């Protein structure tokens, strides 16, 4: 019933390291099987690539 | 609406770009879908009411 | 090294200059986002020095 999404604030950098870490958590987080998911395709695209 | 289109401020998409320089003259997405309907034509209205 | 750097379109306003400049094989046409823009975007040279 609830989906999450990523969103950056107007005028903060991107720090490498905290996409690094969280490409390795959202995978243990989330789920998004074949039954139910948590996140969007956008989301799970961009944890993928980090 | 070609900018508002082409401007990506999240992850992108494919986007393939047609023989003319004419603006909306690209296909984009997935499922690639045709943006040169939405260009005016007077004789028809195809890109707005009607 | 091996990227196309130079093109040919449709006519330019000034008939005398109809070429486009690609550096590393990026396309002008989009405006860019400077905070997420090449996140998974490489060339060859790059590549190879890596």
């Not at chain 2, 494919?14 to 309907?37: A, H, K, M, S, W």
């Amino acid at each position: 019933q609830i989906i999450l999404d990523l969103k950056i604030d107007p005028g903060e950098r991107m720090d490498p390291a905290v996409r690094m870490v969280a490409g390795v958590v959202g995978h243990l987080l989330f789920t998004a099987g074949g039954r139910f998911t948590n996140l969007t395709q956008n989301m799970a695209r961009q944890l993928d690539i980090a | 609406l070609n900018d508002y289109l082409l401007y990506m401020y999240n992850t992108r998409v494919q986007v393939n770009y047609g023989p003319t320089g004419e603006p909306l003259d690209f296909q984009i997405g997935r499922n690639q879908y045709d943006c040169n309907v939405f260009r005016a034509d007077f004789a028809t209205g195809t890109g707005y009411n009607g | 090294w091996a990227t196309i750097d130079v093109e040919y379109r449709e006519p330019a306003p000034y008939v005398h200059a109809q070429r486009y400049i690609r550096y590393c094989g990026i396309d002008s046409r989009e405006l860019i986002n400077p905070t997420t823009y090449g996140i998974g975007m490489t060339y060859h040279c790059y590549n190879e020095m890596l």
